[PDB]
From a paper:
SARS-CoV-2 uses the receptor binding domain (RBD) of spike (S) protein to recognize its host receptor angiotensin-converting enzyme 2 (ACE2) and mediate cell entry. We measured the binding affinities of rabbit and hare angiotensin-converting enzyme 2 (ACE2) with receptor-binding domains (RBDs) from SARS-CoV, SARS-CoV-2, and its variants and found that rabbit and hare ACE2s had broad variant tropism, with significantly enhanced affinities to Omicron BA.4/5 and its subsequent-emerged sub-variants (>10 fold). To elucidate the molecular basis of rabbit ACE2 binding to SARS-CoV, SARS-CoV-2 PT and Omicron BA.4/5 S proteins, we solved the cryo-EM structures of rabbit ACE2 in complex with S proteins of SARS-CoV, SARS-CoV-2 PT, and SARS-CoV-2 Omicron BA.4/5. Q34, a unique residue of rabbit ACE2 compared to other ACE2 orthologs, plays an important role in ACE2 recognition.
To unveil the structural mechanism of SARS-CoV S recognizing rabbit ACE2, we solved the cryo-EM structure of SARS-CoV S in complex with rabbit ACE2. As the resolution of SARS-CoV S/rabbit ACE2 could not meet the required resolution for interface analysis, we further solved the cryo-EM structure of SARS-CoV RBD/rabbit ACE2 at 3.25 Å, allowing the interacting residues to be clearly observed. The SARS-CoV RBD also binds to rabbit ACE2 in a classical pattern. The H-bond network is centered in Patch 2, except for a H-bond between Y83 and N473 in Patch 1. The ACE2 residues involved in H-bond interaction largely resemble those in the PT S/rabbit ACE2 complex. However, Q42 forms a H-bond with Y436 of SARS-CoV RBD, but it is not involved in the H-bond interaction with PT RBD. The other H-bond network involves Q34, D38, Y41, and K353 of rabbit ACE2 and N479, Y481, G482, T486, and G488 of SARS-CoV RBD. The SARS-CoV RBD bound to both rabbit and hare ACE2s with similar binding affinity in comparison with the SARS-CoV-2 PT RBD. However, when S: ACE2 = 1: 3, although two RBDs are in the up state, only one of them is bound to rabbit ACE2, indicating a transition state where the ACE2-binding induces the erection of the adjacent RBD while the second ACE2 has not yet bound. The structures of SARS-CoV S complexed with rabbit ACE2 revealed a correlation between the proportion of ACE2 in sample preparation and S protein conformation, indicating an ACE2-induced RBD erection pattern.
Numbering used by the authors:
A (entry chain B): 329 to 500
B (entry chain A): 19 to 614
The structure:
Amino acid sequence: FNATKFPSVYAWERKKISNCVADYSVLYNSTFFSTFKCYGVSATKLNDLCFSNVYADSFVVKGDDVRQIAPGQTGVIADYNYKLPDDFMGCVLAWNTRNIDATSTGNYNYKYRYLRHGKLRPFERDISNVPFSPDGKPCTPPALNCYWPLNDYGFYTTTGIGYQPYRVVVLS
Amino acid sequence: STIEELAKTFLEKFNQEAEDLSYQSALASWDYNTNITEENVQKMNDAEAKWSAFYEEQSKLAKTYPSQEVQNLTVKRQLQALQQSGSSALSADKSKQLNTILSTMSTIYSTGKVCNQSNPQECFLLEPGLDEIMAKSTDYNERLWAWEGWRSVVGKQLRPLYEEYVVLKNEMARANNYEDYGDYWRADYEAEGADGYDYSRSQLIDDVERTFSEIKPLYEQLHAFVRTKLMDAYPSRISPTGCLPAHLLGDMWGRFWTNLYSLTVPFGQKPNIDVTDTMVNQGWDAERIFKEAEKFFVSVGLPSMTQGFWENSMLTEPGDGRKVVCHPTAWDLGKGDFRIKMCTKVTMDNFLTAHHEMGHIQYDMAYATQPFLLRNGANEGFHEAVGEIMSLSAATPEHLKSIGLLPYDFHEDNETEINFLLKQALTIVGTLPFTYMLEKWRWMVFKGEIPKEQWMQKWWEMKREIVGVVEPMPHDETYCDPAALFHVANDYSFIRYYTRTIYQFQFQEALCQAAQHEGPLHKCDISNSTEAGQKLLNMLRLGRSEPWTLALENVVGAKNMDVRPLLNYFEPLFTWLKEQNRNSFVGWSTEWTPYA
Ligand SMILES: [Zn+2]
């Protein structure tokens, strides 16, 4: 159901669920949920639509980035870490984890990518850590004009409201 | 390859790393400030050293990328802001020499001792005793000896260091292809943009003087009234028409005249509103005070404070005995964390200071969406100017009656308004000539126009030409008079105060004019009026992403500084002064001095 360990963005967790029926109707009197949206349906067609062969994508992001998990919404990480399709719409559910994933001394176990050659197609996953060079010439780091493509977020406890670790699950 | 991609990647990397280093340093500093020990200083110094090392190593490393070939204004502005770093372009030995000179200067200023008037054992320093003796004494000799002794110590202890430091700073500035250090200081107001929106730094001297000639008549109308009201205090010591002696201004140097209200009062038979009472009787506290401040701010249309502000920020003296300074301040630590550190009380000054600090925090949250290198004010005056209009609006009797701290049948008495206006003018107006003088003298020193052996004398000349203050004792070239000031011993800019003072009244006039308020401007309260808040927020969000001329144009409508609102604010005070002064107000002539 739920796990105490969550992966990062460019290592997002993918789960395939089949032959199962879920309701999650507790969302009426559920103040625990920070944000909940549905794009494909507005729960009107839920009566005549059974769930089968669904995908669950899980990761941890920043608050200001939760709006980026949607069709369009260029942003920065929506084109380099996780790209949303235009047609296949499910639902998005993001909740706050300030009290468990944030420590007063620091938490640097979550990474993200901000440099790439070319755009990202939907369902494209990039893992390889190759040095990034803006003008070809395969570099030998740490030579000049030869940067690293990765960074760490650094969620702490005493941050703001949008700079907190939000756990995000997309149901497709 | 193309320069643009290189600059973009470098800027992305710099923002990436700064967003972490700055937060670590700020958190260490806050942890030290909330609890003083001998161990938190080490952590704070470690974080600060790491951040400074990274910033210095990355600042003057992209100079390989020229600033002339950039096409967007965003990337060009970021590169221009990053390139100017300072002494890092100089040799290591020169940097160490400058750092040692600065450390010696700050240390020798901080540990001043003054010991006279009796058997020499009692050392008052500055902060424990000199501020109080300046702000409370009504005796001439005590103030004179304090002034002269403090200057005769610090100036002669500091002058050679400044003499070498100006030369080395000029050489360092020349290393960066500038022409002097004063040009480097005034380069903050340099802005480039559209055809009519550009601003050259050489134009600064043209602007600042042009406005000052328009403030000269009002200031003098104040300068007379104080003088003719000191005859009652000191019988035959201050000249009927001469300049005011330097050490009788209620402060050590003369930055503010705010402590002379007790000597100069229009009508002593009537008191001021809620002066330290009715809050003991009604039973308020810090939480209610901040809640009312938040209520006032939401009634205009600006966003309310976040919960983290209530949870993390301390709002009263700690009950665990931990030692803090708790000088009130508003901290923006980055990553969306804003806090207020202030020891609360049940006085009116705390009531107004809460609103002032809440206005800076509002400005802090205004431009949090801009990129890292541009998250600042439009210039060095906007940030301080934004937070004072709230204090101006909060003190009007309309709001005090609306809250309930005043009786509903208490009318707006004739004497109270002019008392309030006089007390405000005792602080706002009197600080402008002093700032103008300080900045002009330092710029002239850095320009090299005045030779090395004619510094101090020239300084005193300006005292008689702009502000009208005469030195109480003769000073030769050995002294260093501005070295006694805190902002000069630790070198900082000064014109920001002038700019702030003009901008705040421009903003208030614009907002009230948008508020459909009929009558004088002193009874202005933007409560129950969203237009003023909308117009102000239309400017707060820009940050430093646009030249400051466009930032100012968005609310006031003009592209430069205008002084008409400031004179319009004190119009009833102006008329009252011209009616009361059947003498004086005929200027000052610079030949009368206390010693000759
Ligand atoms: Zn302030």
